[PDB]
Symmetry: C3
Subunit: 128 residues, 3 copies
């Protein structure tokens, strides 16, 4: 089972480090300064074509808050298999709880893939 991955540029850290099972770390694609109580979409510099029928889950690393003072506004990001365009680059939605500077190459979040949910039928009933 493979994942085709495209990098924003030749300087981005190749996350080619994985296929053992652990969540894979993602890094800021450049320097980012976020002021307290400000929102900023941090470029992760990667675009992927996930396996058919799969999706990716993105959450911050356990040390992201302590290190950068940010939280992921959407709690857990979901990247569907259809998000495989040549320009579909990933971003980490960050809300700064304190002035913070994120350096290019800094690990800020992580992800893993999972099979999408089975097809369902939402049938309306008047009483439950």
């Amino acid at each position: 089972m493979q994942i085709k991955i495209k990098y924003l540029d030749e300087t981005q850290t190749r996350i080619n480090k994985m296929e053992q099972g652990d969540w894979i770390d993602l890094r800021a694609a450049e320097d980012v300064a976020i002021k307290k109580d400000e929102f900023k979409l941090v470029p992760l510099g990667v675009a992927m074509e996930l396996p058919e029928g799969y999706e990716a889950h993105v959450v911050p690393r356990s040390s992201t808050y302590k290190n950068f003072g940010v939280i992921q506004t959407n709690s857990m990001g979901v990247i569907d298999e259809s998000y495989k365009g040549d320009n579909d680059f990933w971003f980490f939605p960050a809300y700064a709880l304190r002035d913070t500077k994120i350096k290019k190459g800094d690990r800020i979040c992580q992800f893993r893939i999972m099979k999408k949910m089975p097809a369902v039928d939402l049938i309306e009933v008047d009483r439950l």
Copy 2:
């Protein structure tokens, strides 16, 4: 897989359509005004009987903070198969980082189902 769904009333937007595995969007059941740094349980106007052995996870949509300035206080909501009563409606626990307003019918979060955790035994030990 069949999921029985009950709606709060006829004005709630029905969400049955051709599904194929993507997360499903839920919507505010009514207008909701939230002041800066205050909390509000946003009703989603739906109650469901999930498949036996399954549970649902609920997270904000990726554009939820950008549009409404709120985060989900519980990070990811977990709805168990047992939460299937006639009055077990779903809610999105919103905390606003600014004065905001979610309009009736606005897509505000999304969900998917997943098989519940397997049978496991907990064996207490003094050392690992």
Copy 3:
């Protein structure tokens, strides 16, 4: 399957982690006071050896915000199978949105296990 659990000390409340399928509640290992807009890693007083090939996910309980006014800064904690050391204790990263006090034994979060992602091959490309 079996999960080996170690408790910090003899005064910790044994998780009543019971009910096939249900997420399991974790408790504060000691009293903790957190001032509004401040952080605090709340020890849960447990360390576990998860089944091989599995990982744990931890999120706030539905009533955590209402009860203690805190959010989990890393959104969802991810405990890998390898984090099974004798001093590999669990913590709940809490950011208080108001003055709060958590009592030893108070249930503040919950967890479940899940199979880790299948091993994947990341193939770098130049176009998607």
